Design a protein around this ligand. Structure first.
Ligand SMILES: Nc1ncnc2c([C@@H]3O[C@H](CO)[C@@H](O)[C@H]3O)n[nH]c12
Ligand SMILES: Nc1ncnc2c([C@@H]3O[C@H](CO)[C@@H](O)[C@H]3O)n[nH]c12
Lengths: 230, 230
Protein backbone atom coordinates (compact mmCIF):
# COMPACT_ATOMS: atom_id res chain seq x y z
CA UNK A 1 0.00 0.00 0.00
CA UNK A 2 2.56 2.66 0.94
CA UNK A 3 6.36 2.66 0.98
CA UNK A 4 8.49 5.68 1.82
CA UNK A 5 12.14 5.93 0.85
CA UNK A 6 14.37 8.21 2.89
CA UNK A 7 17.85 9.07 1.61
CA UNK A 8 20.69 10.83 3.39
CA UNK A 9 24.40 10.95 2.63
CA UNK A 10 26.07 10.47 5.97
CA UNK A 11 25.50 8.17 8.95
CA UNK A 12 24.99 11.21 11.18
CA UNK A 13 22.16 12.36 8.91
CA UNK A 14 20.23 9.06 9.05
CA UNK A 15 21.03 7.71 12.52
CA UNK A 16 18.21 9.49 14.37
CA UNK A 17 15.53 8.12 12.08
CA UNK A 18 17.16 4.70 11.87
CA UNK A 19 17.03 4.33 15.65
CA UNK A 20 13.30 5.08 15.61
CA UNK A 21 12.43 2.18 13.31
CA UNK A 22 10.76 -0.99 14.55
CA UNK A 23 11.01 -4.22 12.54
CA UNK A 24 14.51 -3.12 11.58
CA UNK A 25 16.54 -5.06 8.95
CA UNK A 26 19.76 -4.01 7.39
CA UNK A 27 20.60 -4.74 3.74
CA UNK A 28 23.84 -3.92 1.90
CA UNK A 29 24.36 -3.69 -1.92
CA UNK A 30 27.51 -2.08 -3.29
CA UNK A 31 28.40 0.70 -0.65
CA UNK A 32 24.74 1.44 -0.02
CA UNK A 33 23.22 0.61 3.36
CA UNK A 34 19.47 0.07 3.57
CA UNK A 35 17.44 -0.10 6.78
CA UNK A 36 13.89 -1.38 6.25
CA UNK A 37 11.23 -1.05 8.92
CA UNK A 38 8.32 0.93 10.30
CA UNK A 39 8.28 4.63 11.22
CA UNK A 40 5.19 6.25 12.73
CA UNK A 41 3.10 3.30 11.49
CA UNK A 42 4.47 3.68 7.94
CA UNK A 43 6.72 1.40 5.89
CA UNK A 44 10.04 3.03 5.10
CA UNK A 45 13.48 2.17 3.82
CA UNK A 46 16.17 4.47 5.02
CA UNK A 47 19.16 4.77 2.77
CA UNK A 48 22.68 6.03 3.51
CA UNK A 49 23.88 7.10 0.06
CA UNK A 50 27.39 8.44 0.41
CA UNK A 51 28.29 11.93 -0.81
CA UNK A 52 27.96 13.53 -4.25
CA UNK A 53 26.01 13.08 -7.48
CA UNK A 54 27.07 9.57 -8.44
CA UNK A 55 26.76 8.04 -4.96
CA UNK A 56 23.28 9.59 -4.72
CA UNK A 57 22.28 8.29 -8.16
CA UNK A 58 23.45 4.79 -7.43
CA UNK A 59 21.68 4.74 -4.09
CA UNK A 60 18.44 6.14 -5.50
CA UNK A 61 18.48 3.74 -8.47
CA UNK A 62 18.78 0.55 -6.09
CA UNK A 63 16.33 2.01 -3.63
CA UNK A 64 13.73 2.37 -6.38
CA UNK A 65 14.62 -0.79 -8.18
CA UNK A 66 14.79 -3.02 -4.98
CA UNK A 67 12.05 -1.54 -2.81
CA UNK A 68 9.54 0.09 -5.19
CA UNK A 69 8.95 3.23 -3.08
CA UNK A 70 5.87 5.38 -3.65
CA UNK A 71 7.65 8.55 -2.59
CA UNK A 72 11.24 9.52 -1.82
CA UNK A 73 12.39 12.03 0.81
CA UNK A 74 15.96 13.39 0.74
CA UNK A 75 17.26 14.66 4.07
CA UNK A 76 20.62 15.94 5.33
CA UNK A 77 22.35 19.34 5.52
CA UNK A 78 23.00 22.20 3.10
CA UNK A 79 24.62 25.63 2.91
CA UNK A 80 22.30 28.64 3.03
CA UNK A 81 22.33 31.10 0.12
CA UNK A 82 19.31 33.09 1.38
CA UNK A 83 20.70 35.59 3.92
CA UNK A 84 17.60 35.34 6.14
CA UNK A 85 18.32 31.68 6.93
CA UNK A 86 20.14 30.52 10.08
CA UNK A 87 21.80 27.23 11.01
CA UNK A 88 19.21 24.65 11.96
CA UNK A 89 16.52 26.15 9.72
CA UNK A 90 14.61 23.55 7.73
CA UNK A 91 14.90 23.59 3.92
CA UNK A 92 12.10 22.41 1.71
CA UNK A 93 12.65 21.90 -2.01
CA UNK A 94 10.49 23.41 -4.71
CA UNK A 95 12.60 22.99 -7.79
CA UNK A 96 16.16 21.76 -7.94
CA UNK A 97 18.92 22.39 -10.50
CA UNK A 98 22.64 21.75 -10.91
CA UNK A 99 24.78 24.86 -10.42
CA UNK A 100 27.91 23.25 -11.89
CA UNK A 101 26.62 21.75 -15.15
CA UNK A 102 27.69 23.75 -18.23
CA UNK A 103 26.62 22.51 -21.67
CA UNK A 104 25.75 26.01 -22.87
CA UNK A 105 28.08 25.46 -25.85
CA UNK A 106 25.23 23.44 -27.39
CA UNK A 107 22.61 26.06 -26.52
CA UNK A 108 21.32 24.43 -23.33
CA UNK A 109 20.49 26.60 -20.34
CA UNK A 110 23.29 26.95 -17.81
CA UNK A 111 22.89 24.11 -15.29
CA UNK A 112 20.98 21.90 -17.73
CA UNK A 113 22.18 18.41 -18.62
CA UNK A 114 21.92 17.75 -22.35
CA UNK A 115 18.54 16.38 -23.26
CA UNK A 116 17.25 16.67 -19.70
CA UNK A 117 14.95 19.27 -18.13
CA UNK A 118 16.47 22.52 -16.87
CA UNK A 119 15.09 21.74 -13.43
CA UNK A 120 13.41 18.96 -11.52
CA UNK A 121 10.17 19.51 -9.61
CA UNK A 122 9.37 18.31 -6.13
CA UNK A 123 5.94 16.77 -5.69
CA UNK A 124 3.55 19.62 -4.94
CA UNK A 125 1.41 17.49 -2.60
CA UNK A 126 4.58 16.72 -0.61
CA UNK A 127 5.62 20.38 -0.45
CA UNK A 128 2.19 21.30 0.91
CA UNK A 129 2.20 18.49 3.46
CA UNK A 130 5.64 19.15 4.90
CA UNK A 131 4.81 22.86 4.99
CA UNK A 132 2.01 22.04 7.44
CA UNK A 133 4.34 19.77 9.40
CA UNK A 134 7.11 22.32 10.01
CA UNK A 135 4.62 24.90 11.23
CA UNK A 136 2.99 22.51 13.67
CA UNK A 137 6.46 21.49 14.86
CA UNK A 138 7.19 25.23 15.21
CA UNK A 139 10.48 24.83 13.35
CA UNK A 140 11.72 27.76 11.27
CA UNK A 141 11.63 26.68 7.63
CA UNK A 142 11.59 27.85 4.02
CA UNK A 143 10.56 26.47 0.63
CA UNK A 144 12.65 27.25 -2.42
CA UNK A 145 15.06 26.35 -5.19
CA UNK A 146 17.89 24.10 -4.06
CA UNK A 147 20.97 23.72 -6.25
CA UNK A 148 23.44 20.82 -6.31
CA UNK A 149 27.01 20.20 -7.47
CA UNK A 150 29.96 17.89 -6.78
CA UNK A 151 31.71 20.61 -4.77
CA UNK A 152 31.50 21.87 -1.20
CA UNK A 153 30.66 25.56 -1.29
CA UNK A 154 33.05 26.95 1.30
CA UNK A 155 34.12 30.34 0.01
CA UNK A 156 32.43 33.62 -0.85
CA UNK A 157 33.83 33.32 -4.36
CA UNK A 158 32.07 30.01 -4.99
CA UNK A 159 28.97 31.40 -3.29
CA UNK A 160 28.78 34.53 -5.47
CA UNK A 161 29.18 32.45 -8.62
CA UNK A 162 26.09 30.48 -7.68
CA UNK A 163 24.08 33.51 -6.52
CA UNK A 164 24.77 35.31 -9.82
CA UNK A 165 23.71 32.30 -11.87
CA UNK A 166 20.68 31.39 -9.73
CA UNK A 167 19.48 34.58 -8.00
CA UNK A 168 16.57 32.73 -6.38
CA UNK A 169 18.59 29.75 -5.13
CA UNK A 170 17.84 29.21 -1.43
CA UNK A 171 20.49 26.63 -0.51
CA UNK A 172 23.25 24.47 -1.99
CA UNK A 173 24.35 20.90 -1.38
CA UNK A 174 25.64 17.80 -3.19
CA UNK A 175 22.93 15.19 -3.80
CA UNK A 176 19.39 16.59 -4.11
CA UNK A 177 19.40 17.26 -7.83
CA UNK A 178 21.04 13.87 -8.58
CA UNK A 179 18.32 12.18 -6.54
CA UNK A 180 15.69 14.26 -8.30
CA UNK A 181 17.08 13.41 -11.74
CA UNK A 182 16.95 9.74 -10.84
CA UNK A 183 13.36 10.08 -9.60
CA UNK A 184 12.53 11.85 -12.85
CA UNK A 185 13.92 8.95 -14.88
CA UNK A 186 11.78 6.47 -12.88
CA UNK A 187 8.88 8.94 -12.43
CA UNK A 188 8.82 8.68 -8.63
CA UNK A 189 7.63 11.74 -6.62
CA UNK A 190 10.21 13.36 -4.34
CA UNK A 191 10.80 16.17 -1.90
CA UNK A 192 13.93 17.42 -0.16
CA UNK A 193 13.74 18.10 3.58
CA UNK A 194 17.17 19.23 4.79
CA UNK A 195 18.46 21.76 7.30
CA UNK A 196 21.07 24.53 7.33
CA UNK A 197 24.46 23.46 8.66
CA UNK A 198 26.39 26.45 7.31
CA UNK A 199 26.19 29.65 5.26
CA UNK A 200 28.31 28.32 2.37
CA UNK A 201 30.97 30.98 2.97
CA UNK A 202 34.55 31.17 4.22
CA UNK A 203 33.47 29.62 7.53
CA UNK A 204 31.32 26.94 5.89
CA UNK A 205 33.68 24.06 6.68
CA UNK A 206 33.95 25.05 10.35
CA UNK A 207 30.23 25.80 10.61
CA UNK A 208 29.46 22.39 9.06
CA UNK A 209 31.48 20.63 11.78
CA UNK A 210 29.86 22.77 14.49
CA UNK A 211 26.26 22.37 13.34
CA UNK A 212 26.07 18.95 11.71
CA UNK A 213 24.27 17.57 14.79
CA UNK A 214 21.83 20.48 15.02
CA UNK A 215 20.88 20.18 11.34
CA UNK A 216 20.36 16.42 11.69
CA UNK A 217 17.93 17.03 14.55
CA UNK A 218 15.67 19.58 12.88
CA UNK A 219 15.59 17.83 9.50
CA UNK A 220 14.96 14.46 11.17
CA UNK A 221 12.19 15.87 13.38
CA UNK A 222 10.46 17.24 10.28
CA UNK A 223 10.91 14.04 8.25
CA UNK A 224 9.57 11.87 11.08
CA UNK A 225 6.52 14.11 11.44
CA UNK A 226 5.97 14.18 7.67
CA UNK A 227 6.13 10.39 7.39
CA UNK A 228 3.46 10.12 10.10
CA UNK A 229 1.10 12.10 7.87
CA UNK A 230 1.60 10.16 4.56
CA UNK B 1 30.36 -17.84 -18.40
CA UNK B 2 31.09 -14.39 -19.84
CA UNK B 3 28.98 -11.24 -20.14
CA UNK B 4 30.25 -7.94 -21.49
CA UNK B 5 28.51 -4.65 -20.81
CA UNK B 6 29.02 -1.81 -23.27
CA UNK B 7 27.90 1.70 -22.35
CA UNK B 8 27.67 4.79 -24.52
CA UNK B 9 25.77 8.03 -24.04
CA UNK B 10 24.22 8.74 -27.40
CA UNK B 11 22.42 6.64 -30.02
CA UNK B 12 25.07 7.58 -32.57
CA UNK B 13 27.75 6.14 -30.29
CA UNK B 14 26.07 2.74 -29.87
CA UNK B 15 24.27 2.22 -33.19
CA UNK B 16 27.18 0.61 -35.06
CA UNK B 17 27.68 -2.06 -32.44
CA UNK B 18 23.96 -2.54 -31.90
CA UNK B 19 23.46 -3.33 -35.59
CA UNK B 20 26.15 -6.01 -35.40
CA UNK B 21 24.38 -8.02 -32.69
CA UNK B 22 22.59 -11.29 -33.40
CA UNK B 23 19.91 -12.57 -31.02
CA UNK B 24 18.95 -8.95 -30.45
CA UNK B 25 16.40 -7.98 -27.74
CA UNK B 26 15.59 -4.54 -26.55
CA UNK B 27 14.77 -3.78 -22.91
CA UNK B 28 13.79 -0.42 -21.40
CA UNK B 29 13.95 0.62 -17.69
CA UNK B 30 13.63 4.29 -16.75
CA UNK B 31 15.27 6.20 -19.77
CA UNK B 32 17.87 3.48 -20.24
CA UNK B 33 17.79 1.34 -23.38
CA UNK B 34 19.40 -2.09 -23.27
CA UNK B 35 20.16 -4.28 -26.28
CA UNK B 36 21.10 -7.84 -25.35
CA UNK B 37 22.67 -10.21 -27.86
CA UNK B 38 25.83 -11.73 -29.27
CA UNK B 39 28.85 -9.87 -30.65
CA UNK B 40 31.81 -11.75 -32.14
CA UNK B 41 30.60 -14.93 -30.40
CA UNK B 42 30.40 -13.13 -27.03
CA UNK B 43 27.40 -12.24 -24.87
CA UNK B 44 26.97 -8.50 -24.51
CA UNK B 45 24.44 -5.95 -23.37
CA UNK B 46 24.78 -2.62 -25.04
CA UNK B 47 23.53 0.30 -23.05
CA UNK B 48 22.57 3.81 -24.18
CA UNK B 49 23.03 5.83 -20.98
CA UNK B 50 22.18 9.43 -21.74
CA UNK B 51 24.67 12.23 -21.03
CA UNK B 52 26.41 13.25 -17.81
CA UNK B 53 27.33 11.80 -14.42
CA UNK B 54 23.89 10.90 -13.10
CA UNK B 55 22.57 9.37 -16.32
CA UNK B 56 25.76 7.30 -16.53
CA UNK B 57 25.46 6.19 -12.89
CA UNK B 58 21.86 5.17 -13.25
CA UNK B 59 22.57 3.25 -16.42
CA UNK B 60 25.62 1.50 -14.99
CA UNK B 61 23.81 0.60 -11.75
CA UNK B 62 20.84 -1.18 -13.72
CA UNK B 63 23.23 -2.73 -16.18
CA UNK B 64 25.16 -4.35 -13.32
CA UNK B 65 22.17 -5.10 -11.20
CA UNK B 66 20.00 -6.57 -14.09
CA UNK B 67 22.61 -8.32 -16.24
CA UNK B 68 25.51 -9.21 -13.92
CA UNK B 69 28.29 -8.26 -16.37
CA UNK B 70 31.82 -9.59 -15.86
CA UNK B 71 33.40 -6.52 -17.44
CA UNK B 72 32.17 -3.11 -18.56
CA UNK B 73 33.43 -1.12 -21.56
CA UNK B 74 32.60 2.59 -21.91
CA UNK B 75 32.70 3.94 -25.45
CA UNK B 76 31.82 7.26 -27.09
CA UNK B 77 33.67 10.52 -27.83
CA UNK B 78 35.86 12.92 -25.83
CA UNK B 79 37.81 16.15 -26.19
CA UNK B 80 41.58 15.84 -26.53
CA UNK B 81 43.81 17.57 -23.96
CA UNK B 82 47.05 15.98 -25.26
CA UNK B 83 48.19 18.18 -28.18
CA UNK B 84 49.54 15.19 -30.14
CA UNK B 85 46.05 13.70 -30.50
CA UNK B 86 43.87 14.17 -33.59
CA UNK B 87 40.15 13.65 -34.22
CA UNK B 88 39.38 9.98 -34.66
CA UNK B 89 42.27 8.84 -32.45
CA UNK B 90 41.30 6.11 -30.02
CA UNK B 91 41.43 6.84 -26.28
CA UNK B 92 42.15 4.16 -23.75
CA UNK B 93 41.67 4.81 -20.04
CA UNK B 94 44.30 4.18 -17.41
CA UNK B 95 43.00 6.08 -14.45
CA UNK B 96 40.02 8.40 -14.39
CA UNK B 97 39.19 11.35 -12.12
CA UNK B 98 36.63 14.15 -11.89
CA UNK B 99 37.99 17.55 -12.92
CA UNK B 100 35.02 19.46 -11.47
CA UNK B 101 34.72 17.99 -7.96
CA UNK B 102 35.99 20.34 -5.24
CA UNK B 103 35.79 19.22 -1.61
CA UNK B 104 39.26 20.55 -0.80
CA UNK B 105 37.72 22.56 2.06
CA UNK B 106 37.72 19.29 4.04
CA UNK B 107 41.29 18.43 3.02
CA UNK B 108 40.42 16.07 0.16
CA UNK B 109 42.49 16.18 -3.03
CA UNK B 110 41.05 18.37 -5.76
CA UNK B 111 38.75 16.19 -7.87
CA UNK B 112 38.13 13.71 -5.05
CA UNK B 113 34.63 12.92 -3.80
CA UNK B 114 34.48 12.82 -0.01
CA UNK B 115 35.28 9.38 1.29
CA UNK B 116 35.99 8.02 -2.18
CA UNK B 117 39.31 7.33 -3.90
CA UNK B 118 41.09 10.19 -5.67
CA UNK B 119 40.96 8.19 -8.88
CA UNK B 120 39.46 5.04 -10.30
CA UNK B 121 41.57 2.41 -12.05
CA UNK B 122 40.79 0.65 -15.28
CA UNK B 123 41.38 -3.09 -15.29
CA UNK B 124 45.01 -3.61 -16.23
CA UNK B 125 44.28 -6.84 -18.13
CA UNK B 126 41.75 -4.88 -20.21
CA UNK B 127 44.20 -2.06 -20.91
CA UNK B 128 46.76 -4.57 -22.14
CA UNK B 129 44.26 -6.41 -24.31
CA UNK B 130 42.80 -3.37 -26.05
CA UNK B 131 46.34 -2.07 -26.55
CA UNK B 132 47.04 -5.14 -28.68
CA UNK B 133 43.73 -4.69 -30.49
CA UNK B 134 44.27 -1.08 -31.61
CA UNK B 135 47.71 -1.90 -32.97
CA UNK B 136 46.47 -4.86 -34.98
CA UNK B 137 43.61 -2.68 -36.26
CA UNK B 138 46.29 -0.09 -37.13
CA UNK B 139 44.27 2.66 -35.46
CA UNK B 140 46.15 5.54 -33.86
CA UNK B 141 45.55 5.34 -30.11
CA UNK B 142 46.79 6.40 -26.68
CA UNK B 143 46.45 5.22 -23.09
CA UNK B 144 46.14 7.76 -20.31
CA UNK B 145 44.25 9.62 -17.62
CA UNK B 146 40.75 10.61 -18.64
CA UNK B 147 38.87 13.24 -16.64
CA UNK B 148 35.10 13.72 -16.37
CA UNK B 149 32.69 16.49 -15.39
CA UNK B 150 29.09 17.60 -15.99
CA UNK B 151 30.25 20.28 -18.43
CA UNK B 152 31.16 20.33 -22.12
CA UNK B 153 34.70 21.66 -22.43
CA UNK B 154 34.36 24.07 -25.34
CA UNK B 155 36.67 26.96 -24.56
CA UNK B 156 40.38 27.45 -24.01
CA UNK B 157 39.60 28.89 -20.59
CA UNK B 158 37.87 25.71 -19.43
CA UNK B 159 40.62 23.68 -21.08
CA UNK B 160 43.47 25.49 -19.31
CA UNK B 161 41.74 25.10 -15.95
CA UNK B 162 41.75 21.34 -16.42
CA UNK B 163 45.29 21.17 -17.81
CA UNK B 164 46.64 23.13 -14.83
CA UNK B 165 44.86 20.88 -12.35
CA UNK B 166 45.63 17.60 -14.14
CA UNK B 167 48.83 18.12 -16.17
CA UNK B 168 48.79 14.50 -17.34
CA UNK B 169 45.12 14.40 -18.35
CA UNK B 170 44.84 13.01 -21.89
CA UNK B 171 41.17 13.69 -22.65
CA UNK B 172 37.95 15.00 -21.10
CA UNK B 173 34.33 13.90 -21.33
CA UNK B 174 31.16 13.51 -19.23
CA UNK B 175 30.54 9.92 -18.11
CA UNK B 176 33.68 7.79 -17.75
CA UNK B 177 34.48 8.63 -14.15
CA UNK B 178 30.81 8.25 -13.09
CA UNK B 179 30.77 4.81 -14.71
CA UNK B 180 34.08 3.97 -13.05
CA UNK B 181 32.84 5.11 -9.64
CA UNK B 182 29.80 2.89 -10.06
CA UNK B 183 31.99 -0.06 -11.08
CA UNK B 184 34.14 0.62 -8.03
CA UNK B 185 31.09 0.45 -5.75
CA UNK B 186 30.08 -2.92 -7.27
CA UNK B 187 33.71 -4.05 -7.83
CA UNK B 188 33.27 -4.71 -11.55
CA UNK B 189 36.33 -4.30 -13.85
CA UNK B 190 36.09 -1.56 -16.48
CA UNK B 191 37.93 0.14 -19.30
CA UNK B 192 37.12 3.20 -21.39
CA UNK B 193 37.54 2.95 -25.17
CA UNK B 194 36.50 6.26 -26.73
CA UNK B 195 37.72 8.38 -29.63
CA UNK B 196 38.57 12.04 -30.19
CA UNK B 197 35.71 14.11 -31.60
CA UNK B 198 37.21 17.51 -30.77
CA UNK B 199 40.12 19.34 -29.13
CA UNK B 200 38.05 20.74 -26.25
CA UNK B 201 38.74 24.32 -27.36
CA UNK B 202 36.83 27.23 -28.86
CA UNK B 203 35.92 25.08 -31.87
CA UNK B 204 35.00 22.05 -29.76
CA UNK B 205 31.25 22.34 -30.34
CA UNK B 206 31.66 22.64 -34.12
CA UNK B 207 34.32 19.93 -34.21
CA UNK B 208 32.03 17.63 -32.20
CA UNK B 209 29.27 18.01 -34.80
CA UNK B 210 31.75 17.49 -37.64
CA UNK B 211 33.49 14.42 -36.22
CA UNK B 212 30.87 12.61 -34.15
CA UNK B 213 30.51 9.98 -36.91
CA UNK B 214 34.27 9.50 -37.34
CA UNK B 215 34.78 9.02 -33.59
CA UNK B 216 31.93 6.50 -33.42
CA UNK B 217 33.58 4.45 -36.17
CA UNK B 218 37.07 4.18 -34.68
CA UNK B 219 35.89 3.58 -31.11
CA UNK B 220 33.33 1.02 -32.30
CA UNK B 221 35.87 -0.79 -34.47
CA UNK B 222 38.19 -1.10 -31.46
CA UNK B 223 35.42 -2.20 -29.08
CA UNK B 224 34.16 -4.85 -31.51
CA UNK B 225 37.69 -6.21 -31.94
CA UNK B 226 38.30 -6.15 -28.19
CA UNK B 227 35.09 -8.04 -27.44
CA UNK B 228 36.15 -10.75 -29.91
CA UNK B 229 39.26 -11.35 -27.79
CA UNK B 230 37.60 -11.58 -24.30
N1 LIG C 1 27.95 24.58 1.88
C1 LIG C 1 27.75 23.37 1.37
N2 LIG C 1 28.11 23.09 0.06
C2 LIG C 1 27.93 21.85 -0.49
N3 LIG C 1 27.41 20.77 0.14
C3 LIG C 1 27.02 21.03 1.50
C4 LIG C 1 26.44 20.17 2.51
C5 LIG C 1 26.06 18.67 2.38
O1 LIG C 1 26.87 17.92 3.34
C6 LIG C 1 27.91 17.09 2.68
C7 LIG C 1 29.24 17.94 2.51
O2 LIG C 1 30.32 17.26 1.88
C8 LIG C 1 27.16 16.74 1.37
O3 LIG C 1 26.32 15.58 1.49
C9 LIG C 1 26.23 17.90 1.03
O4 LIG C 1 25.05 17.48 0.37
N4 LIG C 1 26.26 20.88 3.64
N5 LIG C 1 26.71 22.16 3.41
C10 LIG C 1 27.17 22.28 2.13
N1 LIG D 1 35.18 18.47 -25.26
C1 LIG D 1 34.31 17.72 -24.59
N2 LIG D 1 33.97 18.02 -23.29
C2 LIG D 1 33.07 17.27 -22.57
N3 LIG D 1 32.43 16.18 -23.02
C3 LIG D 1 32.76 15.82 -24.38
C4 LIG D 1 32.30 14.74 -25.23
C5 LIG D 1 31.27 13.63 -24.89
O1 LIG D 1 30.14 13.77 -25.79
C6 LIG D 1 28.92 14.27 -25.11
C7 LIG D 1 28.90 15.86 -25.13
O2 LIG D 1 27.78 16.47 -24.50
C8 LIG D 1 29.14 13.62 -23.71
O3 LIG D 1 28.63 12.28 -23.63
C9 LIG D 1 30.63 13.52 -23.47
O4 LIG D 1 30.98 12.40 -22.68
N4 LIG D 1 32.91 14.84 -26.42
N5 LIG D 1 33.75 15.93 -26.39
C10 LIG D 1 33.68 16.54 -25.17
Amino acid sequence: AMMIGIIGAMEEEVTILKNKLTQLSEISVAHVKFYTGILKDREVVITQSGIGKVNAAISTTLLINKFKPDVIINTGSAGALDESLNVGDVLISDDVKYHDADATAFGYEYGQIPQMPVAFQSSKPLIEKVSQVVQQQQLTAKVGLIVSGDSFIGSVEQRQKIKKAFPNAMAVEMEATAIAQTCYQFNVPFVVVRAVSDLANGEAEMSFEAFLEKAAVSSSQTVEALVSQL
